[PDB]
Design a protein around this ligand. Structure first.
Ligand code: IIY
Ligand code: CL
Length: 130
């Protein structure tokens, strides 16, 4: 229905706004763009599902997210990819992991404060209906 399409458009608006706020945070710069294979040629072979905030924005616009839950799965992927690819005790790796965990915690906390739980429940019920 058109009311359903208004619901998902509000969802996309909300997700673009949250994603923009993460993308402009200097700590998260490394997660704003896909890894360059010309820097890291083994990335694409170690990490099977690369994910970054630029790709998240593209997916919102392609209507790939019908719930905040499916958006958060991609935030989680950004974070777990960074933990998996950079697992060493040295400071370069520790810094990336700290930032990856901060990216995830920040996204969850914005959503906890600003997403209405009845709005998410509606999205889930429309999605489940399709
Ligand atoms: C699980 C996410 C991040 N963890 C860290 O690397 C924390 N490192 C320190 C000592 O600041
Ligand atoms: Cl830096």
């Amino acid at each position: 229905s058109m009311q359903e399409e208004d619901t998902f458009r509000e969802l996309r608006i909300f997700l673009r706004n949250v994603t923009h706020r993460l993308a402009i945070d200097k700590r998260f710069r490394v997660f704003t763009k896909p890894v360059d294979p010309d820097e890291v040629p083994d990335y694409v072979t170690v990490i099977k599902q690369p994910m970054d905030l630029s790709s998240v924005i593209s997916k919102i616009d392609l209507h790939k997210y019908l719930t905040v839950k499916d958006y958060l799965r991609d935030i989680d992927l950004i974070c777990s990819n960074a933990l998996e690819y950079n697992p060493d005790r040295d400071p370069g790796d520790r810094l990336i992991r700290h930032r990856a965990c901060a990216l995830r915690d920040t996204a969850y906390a914005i959503i906890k404060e600003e997403l209405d739980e009845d709005f998410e429940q509606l999205c889930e019920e429309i999605q489940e209906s399709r």
